[PDB]
Structure formats: C-alpha cells, structure tokens
Swiss-Prot record, chain A:
This is Thrombin light chain. The lineage of its organism: Eukaryota, Metazoa, Chordata, Craniata, Vertebrata. It comes from Homo sapiens (Human).
C-alpha cells in the first residue's frame, strides 16, 4: 500500500532522529 | 514560518517550492507525493479576487531545496508542469473551502537523499492522528513575521486545536474540510505559518510505522502569530477521494 513514502533517506533510513522529531512523539501523550 | 528554526538538511525531502517564471518569485510551498505528482493549495494557483489564475507554463517547481535563494546545482530539481488540477468545488469566494490542487510534472523526478515523497493519510491515520492537542510539523520559506525572509527552510511544530476553539476564534466559517493548529495564549509558546508558506505541508509522524503523513496543507489565516489566532489547513484525508480520482484517471 505505501511502498517507500514517508521514510526520509537521511533519517528514518539511517535510524537517525531530527532535532524536534520527538516533540511530536511526546505530544501524543499530551504532555509527559 | 514564524518562531520556527532552520531545518536540517533533508529533514523534509518532500518539500516543494512553487515558482513563478516571469517575474521570478517564490509563490508558495507544496509537496511531493509521487515521482510525478505535487500537492499544493488551490489559492496558490487560482484566486480570481486578485486575478490569480496561473497555468502550466507560468510556473516551475523546485524540488529538493534547502536554501531560500542559493542555486543548489545537481541537488535540487527544477520541473515543468504538464497539467494543473484544481478541486471542482474549491470555494475561493467565501472561505477557501477545499483549498487543494494537484500538478502533474512533465517528466518524473528521480528520488535522492533530498528528494523523497511524503505519505498521504488514510482512514486509520486520520482517525488516530488528527486530534486536538497533538503536534504536527509545518515547513516553508515564507516570511518570519507579518509583512522577513529566511535564508534557509524553516520548521515549526504546532499543536492541533479543538474545532470549537477554531470556530470561536474567527468570524470566518470553518468546514470539515479544514482544521486549525497553533498555540493558545496561556502556554508560553509561539509559532505559526505565514505568507509564502501557503500550499506547504502539515505533517505528522506515525507512532506505529514511523512514517510521515501530510495531514494538511497551509491554507489560510488572519495575520501571523497573533494571540487568539490560529492557522488553518486543508484537511487532506477528507479530500483524498478526489486525490485518488485524479491520479488514477490521469496516469
Ligand atoms: C478558473 C478561472 O477563474 N477561470 C478559468 C481560467 O483560469 C482557465 O484558464 C480557463 C480554461 O479554459 O477556464 C476558466
């Protein structure tokens, strides 16, 4: 269904997170 | 982008720059969803109130860029438009409802570390990710404040706001085909999208498959970064049907 879409070569592909990436991740908890 | 920060090299490989041929100028942001399809806001291509009515040859698409002005040879790709597709029920008259458009490239672009397509949302992604309180990410080469130009692509994460709030924050009428994001007065944090950023992507990272999905498109607002105000974005999933229809039909 989605093939490669959404996976960044310089990040997801290299198991590397960007600077603010987890701010989004943590907002799912709605805080901490 | 207001109150944002310089983006990292390649942290938004689907980011597209909509460019006017003559006179040369940055028109809007946009996104790569396929090697041949670009997604953007309809008001970027069509807005009669200002005589806006660009066509295939009046524009160019610059993919894989980072610098606001620098020519990134053999990194960025300049593509021509084969055909423009504007949502048939796009309401430019009152509130820019269904502010969405597609552009087919004359020739497919080659993906690289700097050029790669984002994911469209599907029912599961939309139902679980598009929720007030959750943060999304907006990027673009728009102004740094209300009418101001970044030398590099800016990025800012913004929390999605509950529909009621979005409504009781403006006298313009909101549709189910749009949503709003931004910070509220109290929570000492700022940031918003601004002119030049329109047509750009509002994305979110899935906590399940780790992929990025464009939940929205920078559609409109009333000023930039002003308390009691929020940015509005085209609800991509709500209009995905039309998207699928055009892509499948013209392939
Ligand atoms: C949409 C608008 O305001 N006017 C459109 C004009 O842009 C388009 O060039 C022409 C094509 O036949 O259809 C009419």
């Amino acid at each position: 269904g989605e093939a490669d879409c959404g996976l960044r070569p310089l990040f997801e592909k290299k198991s590397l997170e960007d600077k603010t990436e987890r701010e989004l991740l943590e907002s799912y908890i709605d805080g901490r | 982008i207001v109150e944002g920060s310089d983006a990292e090299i390649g942290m938004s490989p689907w980011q597209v720059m909509l460019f006017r041929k003559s006179p040369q100028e940055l028109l809007c942001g946009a996104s790569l969803i396929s090697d041949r399809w670009v997604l953007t806001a309809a008001h970027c291509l069509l807005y009669p109130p200002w005589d806006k009515n660009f066509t295939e040859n009046d524009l160019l698409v610059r993919i894989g860029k980072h610098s606001r002005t620098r020519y990134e040879a053999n990194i960025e790709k300049i593509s021509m438009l084969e055909k423009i597709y504007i949502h048939p029920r796009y309401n430019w008259r009152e509130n820019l409802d269904r502010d969405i458009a597609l552009m087919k490239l004359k020739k497919p672009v080659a993906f690289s570390d700097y050029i790669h397509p984002v994911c469209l949302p599907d029912r599961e992604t939309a139902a679980s990710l598009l929720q007030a309180g959750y943060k999304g990410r907006v990027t673009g080469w728009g102004n740094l404040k209300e009418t101001g130009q970044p030398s590099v692509l800016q990025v800012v994460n913004l929390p999605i706001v509950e529909r009621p709030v979005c409504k009781d924050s403006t006298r313009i009428r909101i549709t189910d085909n749009m949503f709003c994001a931004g910070y509220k007065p109290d929570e000492g944090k700022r940031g918003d999208a601004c002119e030049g950023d329109s047509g750009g992507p509002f994305v979110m990272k899935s906590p399940f498959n780790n992929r990025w999905y464009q939940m929205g498109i920078v559609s409109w607002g009333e000023g930039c970064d002003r308390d009691g105000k929020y940015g509005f974005y085209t609800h991509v999933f709500r209009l995905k049907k039309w998207i699928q229809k055009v892509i499948d039909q013209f392939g």
